[PDB]
Amino acid sequence: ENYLNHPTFGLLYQICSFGSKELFATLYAQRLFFLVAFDARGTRFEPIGRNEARMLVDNRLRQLRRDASLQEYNQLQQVFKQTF
Amino acid sequence: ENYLNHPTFGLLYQICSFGSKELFATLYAQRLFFLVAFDARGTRFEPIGRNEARMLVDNRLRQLRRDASLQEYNQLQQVFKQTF
Amino acid sequence: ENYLNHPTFGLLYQICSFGDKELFATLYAQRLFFLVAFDARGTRFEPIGRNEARMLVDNRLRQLRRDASLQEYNQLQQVFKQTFL
Amino acid sequence: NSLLTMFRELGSGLPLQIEQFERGKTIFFPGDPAERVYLLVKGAVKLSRVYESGEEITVALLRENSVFGVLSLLTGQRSDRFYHAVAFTPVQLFSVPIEFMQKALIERPELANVMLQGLSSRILQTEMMIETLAHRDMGSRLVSFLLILCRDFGIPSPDGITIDLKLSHQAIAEAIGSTRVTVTRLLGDLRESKLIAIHKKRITVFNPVALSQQFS
Amino acid sequence: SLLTMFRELGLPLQIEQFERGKTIFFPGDPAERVYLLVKGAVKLSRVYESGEEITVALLRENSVFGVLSLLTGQRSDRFYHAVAFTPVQLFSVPIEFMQKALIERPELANVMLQGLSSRILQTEMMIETLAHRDMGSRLVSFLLILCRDFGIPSPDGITIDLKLSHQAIAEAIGSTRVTVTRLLGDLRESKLIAIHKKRITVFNPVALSQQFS
Amino acid sequence: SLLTMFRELGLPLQIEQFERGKTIFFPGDPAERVYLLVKGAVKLSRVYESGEEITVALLRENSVFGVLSLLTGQRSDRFYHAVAFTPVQLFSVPIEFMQKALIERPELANVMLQGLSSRILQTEMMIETLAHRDMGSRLVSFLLILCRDFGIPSPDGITIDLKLSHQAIAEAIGSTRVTVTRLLGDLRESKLIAIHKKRITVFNPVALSQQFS
Amino acid sequence: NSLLTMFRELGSLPLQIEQFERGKTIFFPGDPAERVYLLVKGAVKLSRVYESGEEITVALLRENSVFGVLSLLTGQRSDRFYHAVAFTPVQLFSVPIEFMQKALIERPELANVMLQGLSSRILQTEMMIETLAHRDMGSRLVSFLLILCRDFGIPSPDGITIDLKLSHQAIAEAIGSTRVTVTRLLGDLRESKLIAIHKKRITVFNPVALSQQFS
DNA sequence: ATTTTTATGTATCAGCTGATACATAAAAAT
DNA sequence: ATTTTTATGTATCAGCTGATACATAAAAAT
DNA sequence: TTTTATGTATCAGCTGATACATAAAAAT
DNA sequence: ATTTTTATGTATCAGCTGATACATAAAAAT
Ligand SMILES: O=C(O)CCC(=O)C(=O)O
Ligand SMILES: O=C(O)CCC(=O)C(=O)O
Ligand SMILES: O=C(O)CCC(=O)C(=O)O
Ligand SMILES: O=C(O)CCC(=O)C(=O)O
Structure with a gap:
């Protein structure tokens, strides 16, 4: 239930953690899913x-x-x- | 959504057909599952x-x-x- | 008000002593009763x-x-x- | 399956005759020596406790191929009953003694298997009821119980599952630890939610699964 | 006899040790084993996906559980959560070695059906408790079972010989932990109980039972 | 231009033939392609678990769809049900061939943003239709769009050149097939429309549009 | 990502970010459609106005969205028909069609980034179709609330506060209803303890849970 | 040893739900 | 067939009880 | 056949239309 | 600071519209 604002697609919410990449998804019926990398570089995203x-x-x-x-x-x- | 009365466990409902063996399940939370075949006698439930x-x-x-x-x-x- | 732990039925309490042979009973609603033979290894829970x-x-x-x-x-x-x- | 067949061959000579019981008839009372084991064949059996205050509490409502009168297995004829076995409905059953059983178990190892099968089922069904009553929401608790009813006495119907047995608001209330009034109250709220319907004193659920999905 | 008969189903059979809070079996495990609690207490609970726990029974010494294994064998998967509520000793014999052991000893078949019977009744006894309407009456009824199964003789009453969280109690009685305490507080003012070292102690267990005529 | 430009992305690119009622893509398919309708009509619909279909838009000639592929690439999976409502011709160029084709031809990028623009407005036009409350007004608004996109000139008005079911209409305007039938019959009594060979024909479209003052 | 970067380099040098204050209109019906816009920060309300004086919200746009899309079809020749108002404090870019004609043939990199922007619009507009295609005004409202939470929601202590001030009529205009019904349905959500209005802003709780209901 | 995580006491609401009472329908008694 | 006992629908009101939140004590943690 | 689509009739309960009191916001 | 214009809460009832069910026509199956 953790939230994150994607520049293009707006609000996202966390599905699960792995090890630590967390899985996130779109809020209206979860049609898209995102793998995030909270590097010093910042917020690295990767769509799946x-x-x-x-x-x-x-x-x-x-x-x-x-x-x-x-x-x-x-x-x-x-x-x-x-x-x- | 087809129903069948098991002697011991009571009412069951059909999940799917195969070919024609059907899968059935228990009613309170589908706690178990049954493989049924309509032999002239039936009498052939196989639990899984x-x-x-x-x-x-x-x-x-x-x-x-x-x-x-x-x-x-x-x-x-x-x-x-x-x-x- | 003496107690004894039955293997299967758990806690029991003494009703009356007797000459040996203390009647005992179950604790919840006292729904059963037992003749206890307190012999050296002569222990017996004879149900009544x-x-x-x-x-x-x-x-x-x-x-x-x-x-x-x-x-x-x-x-x-x-x-x-x-x-x- | 086998339980009905195995109990057939423990007879008065001979087979053993199927005992007939009419609606409302008691099978055993508190104070009777527990010397027999029963098996319900068709209909329903209501086991209840009676208090001095005149209060009845339903322990379990048993269905076909169920083994009861399980007290006789522990000490034999020596102990006296404490529950009230009444015939919830028109009922058929067998009634073998414990001393006839002692011989019947060493006789048939096949029946030993079929018996522990039946006793297992009882534990679960009674434990299933524990789940139901362990609810806090009386709404949730009632639906849980209704699901069981269907499971055991539900027959397929046009739009859902009609519990093929008549029910007294009090009988329900005695089973789920409530008063008759609430039972009626909650049932009316399910009628407004249109998840149930009472046709001819018979209750009927719709999309049973859908009701079960609410108890994730 | 249960403790004695289970000893000889192996060679002998080793007593498994488990520490406090340790799980014995999970939902999803194949039911292939039959258990017997020897010392301590076992909590059987149901878990919902909402994260909610419901106590089915709190088992005592010389009790038989893992009973699903007797129905189809290894074929079925468990659905309750068997947790050691206290420090616990148990036996754990498989179904296929039991098939052998029951026809081997007709003495243990008797001792086993004794065990299974006791379970039905104890579970049915719990049904009586929760079929109460008054949460006050319901709590005491449950407390009486605890005192029957786990209570030890005490200076002024009966101390239930195990530490219980209101929640554990609540989950078992199907209510809020607060209500548990709330009611407890009210029995303390009526001075029917005392909590010494986090253990519940009843004053005159007979007197409390007389309120259930 | 759109018809002309898409001919040259692949060697030419073949016109794919699709028969009456055939599905183009299902939910679950990787969105790796961009489509361009050449002849006929395409129904895009959403399907719920309840089994319910909702028409998103009914697309016409020289329209760009499959537009999911342009956002992440083949990475995302489809969610709508693209079915050919009529016999259809289309082009079907991949995303990775398109990344190539856009940097290749800036004339095409012009041509493409033209088609995309049209889509936004046509979809927004539909929002206007559904945002009405009077289901009467809502239906006519929808009817006008059909006549705009698929209507052919006729002796006494405009015949919507395609066969449409009452449920298909009901799925598009957020209603039951029943109400569609009711309201259409009331327009037949008002003699504003005629049903010829299962085809809806409009009488004096402008007069119908003038009711949207 | 690139949209904000690409629009920067069509230069009046680059092009200046236009500032617009709250409630200020960007374009009205009747204006020559000769420009394309890109919203940078805030929310843009696109609405249709009838002669009866009635406003209908078509779409409520978010950051990095392309609008004023009429200008790309015929050019300056067409006149607008929607009412583009700054729903909140807004920053945006505003490049002409004739400067864009040059900009497209200049950069096929921007052509890519533009069609990406227009794609997003199709879906967001189609998303709205789903919402209004409902029958149950209760279901229809929540569906709409989910979109607002998706586009303008900020993380909050107990839930998701939609980071914009919204009038009951403005909601009613978007979901095809009266202010009254919006109020009544919201009140029923307060009793269901699913929302809370704190400082005039709607706050849902684990909206996730609300979305399941829309399997 | 410190800290900090978990368990407990207190305070206040709103809304189920049990208690109480009545008219009428259905079932058992007669 | 007559009566009559039991079951049901409806209406009200008083209070326990679940939900929510906070301070503080007890236990685990390290 | 056999499936699917369509016309017709009848309901229950939302919801739009109408009207008023009061609070909040913009105007002044 | 005074006004006033616009937004909001509350309460009702009329009628379209969704849900359900059935007869009949049309079209796909077959
Ligand atoms: O065992 C008894 O005699 C009373 C209860 C009962 O028969 C049972 O639940 O099996
Ligand atoms: O036997 C099972 O697997 C579940 C019930 C139980 O744990 C038991 O009573 O043994
Ligand atoms: O792009 C997709 O995959 C689905 C949506 C679509 O095709 C479209 O609206 O163009
Ligand atoms: O482009 C138009 O003229 C109206 C729609 C719109 O402004 C837009 O979506 O950008």
């Missing part, structure tokens, strides 16, 4: 499509069950069911 | 878990595109979205 | 129902009346009253 972004959050869900906690599994679960 | 049931409806989606209509996929897409 | 259990406490009440202390007669009255009245 539904097909790739679906399986990518899917991978993170599998990663949290295997070697990770639950609170974060449960909340990302709601995020995934919200988007896809 | 979430992980197997997931990839099985998933294969049917692809199959539809590879070789089937849109809505049969349009409709089963609804179903997968609701259960998964 | 309300019908037999009722008349058995009742018998000890009469027994203390004829030839038995008031204090203990007074106390067993309490237990009977709580379990059965």
Whole structure:
């Protein structure tokens, strides 16, 4: 539920973190998705499509069950069911 | 959206057809899934878990595109979205 | 008001002593009763129902009346009253 | 499946006869020696506690192929019942003794399997009810319970699922820990939300799944 | 006998150790095991995707759980969260070795069905508690079960021998932690309970039960 | 110019033939192409999970669509349902061939921004139509657009040269097929339109437009 | 990104950023359409006015958006028909069509960056079509609110405050309704605890949640 | 040892929901 | 067939209880 | 057949139209 | 500072319009 203003596409919201690139998406029905790089250079962006972004959050869900906690599994679960 | 009364677990509802074996699921949160075949006797329910049931409806989606209509996929897409 | 931990049923509490053979009972709504044989490794939880259990406490009440202390007669009255009245 | 078949062969000689019970008839009372195990074949069985205040609390409302009278398994005839097994509806069932069962279990290892299957189902169904009553929102709690009803006694209907059994507002209230008035209150609010309909004292849900999706 | 019979289903079978808060099984694990709690307490809970926890039962010593494995075998996947609420010792025998062990010992089959029966009743007992209307009545009913399963004899009453968070309690009684405290505070003013070392202590358990005639 | 310029991006570029009712792109496809309608009509629609279709716009000849590809490239996935409402001819140039083609021809970039401009206004024109409240006024506004884009001159008025279903109309003006039927029948009693071979014909368009004072 | 950079170099040197104060009109119906604009900071309200005195909001544009798009079709020959008003304090560029004719053949780099800008417009306008194509005025309002949150929303303590002051009528003009109905529906969102108006600005809560409802 | 994270006490609202009472419909009694 | 007991719909009002927010104590953390 | 599209009828409940009191903003 | 013009809250009811269901015509299937 973290927000970020894209120059062209306006407001975005965070889907998940990775390691630390976080996944972000458009607010009206999430048609586009963005990989962000908070470098000293600043805010580096990298657009991705539904097909790739679906399986990518899917991978993170599998990663949290295997070697990770639950609170974060449960909340990302709601995020995934919200988007896809 | 077809219904069937399991002796032990009560009411069930159909997920998808295959060919004609159908997938069925439990009503309170689809906690489990059943492979049914209309033998003259039926009497042939085969239980399966979430992980197997997931990839099985998933294969049917692809199959539809590879070789089937849109809505049969349009409709089963609804179903997968609701259960998964 | 003596307690004993049954493996399966959990906490029990003593109803009446007896000559060995302390009647015990379940803690929630006292829905069962047990004959405990406190022998060296002679421990036994012989289960009994309300019908037999009722008349058995009742018998000890009469027994203390004829030839038995008031204090203990007074106390067993309490237990009977709580379990059965 | 097998439960109905296996209980058939534990007979008075012979098979064992199917016992008939009319609507409202009690099967066992508090104070009866628990010496028998039952299996409901068709209809519904209501298990309840009765208080001195005259208050009834529904523990579970059992469906077909369910094993009950499970007290007899622990000590045998020695213990006395405490719940009120009444025949929620017209009911058929079997009624084998515990001493007949002791022999029947060493006789058939196949029945041993089929029995623990039935007992497992009971644990879950009773635990499922725990989920329902553990709600805070009485609205949420009632729908959860209604979902169960459908699951167990729901028949397919034109526009949804009609619970194929009649229900008393009080009977519902006794099951979900409420008063008759609220039950009526909440049901009317679901009628305005048009998720349910009562046709001929029979309740009927629509898009059941859709109701279940609200309990993510 | 449960503790004794489970010992011999292996060679012997090793007692698994688990520390406080450790999870035993998660939703998604294949149900292939049958469990027996030996020392301490086990919390079974349901997790919603909203992040909400609901306590199904808080199990006591010599209790059988992991019961789904008996229905299809390894085929089904769990859906509750089995967590060690306290420091815990348990046994954990597989379903396929149990198929052997039950036909091996008809003595343990009796001892097992004893265990399963107790579960049904204890779970049904909880139904009574939550079928209450008065949250005050509902809380005490639950407290009585706690005192029955975990309570130890005390100087002035019965101290429930385990530390419980209002939330844990609340999740179990399906209410707000505040309400839990709120009500507790009101029983403290009525002086029916005392909280010593974060443990609930009832004054005269019989007296509280008499309010449920 | 648009027809002429798109001929030269690829070796020429072939006119792709698409039959009646055939889909052009589905939601889920990578947006890697820009399209140009040459002959016929194209329906762009949004589909919900409820199974509901909403017509975004019904595009005409020399229109540019598939415009998602110009923002991130093949990176983004489609979301609308591009279906040929009638028999259609079109061009279909890729994004990576277009990045080439824009720096190549500044005459084409002129030609393209022309087509894009037209789209904005035509889509904004539709906003005007839907922003009405009177469904009567809203329908006529929509009818006028159809006559503008697909109407052919006729003996007594203008026949909308394409077959249209009442649901297709209802999906475009935010209504049920029922209300479309009701209001059309009221215009037939007012004798402002005629339905000839399932084709809607306008009587004195200007008079209909003058009702938008 | 490049749009702000590219417009800088069509030079009256570069071209000066025009300042416009709040509520000031940029163009009216009847003006010769000889220019294209680029909004830099703030919000631009495009509206149609009827003879009845009624205003209908067509689109409410955001930063890095290209408008005044009529000028590219015939040139100076056509007269405008919408009412472009500065909805907030605004910065913008304003280059002519004849200077653009030169600018396009000069730079095919700008041609690319321009069609990118016009693409965005198509979608944003089409996005609005989705919103107004709803039936339920409740659903229609939230859909519209989501767009405002997407374009003008700023991060807030408990939710998303749409960083612009909006009148109930201005909302009603955009969603085809009366001020009354907007007020009533907003009040029902306050009771549902989904929004809050703090310093005359609408604030949604985890709008995400609101968007699911629009599967 | 410090800090800081987690658990608890207090204070105040608004709105379910239980209590109370009545007329009428449906079911069981007769 | 007559009566009558039980079930239902509707209307009201008083108070517990969930939601929200804050200060402070207790426990984990490091 | 068989699917899909269309005309017709009848409803419940939003929502537009009308009118007024009061607060806020712009004008002065 | 006084005005006044414009925006907002509140309360009603009339009628178009969405939802549901059915008969019949047209068009696609077949
Ligand atoms: O076990 C008993 O005798 C009473 C309750 C019951 O039959 C059961 O729930 O199985
Ligand atoms: O058995 C299961 O898998 C779930 C229920 C449970 O944990 C149990 O009672 O054993
Ligand atoms: O560009 C897309 O992929 C979908 C939208 C579209 O085709 C268009 O509006 O031109
Ligand atoms: O271009 C026009 O004349 C009206 C629409 C508009 O201004 C725009 O979208 O840029």
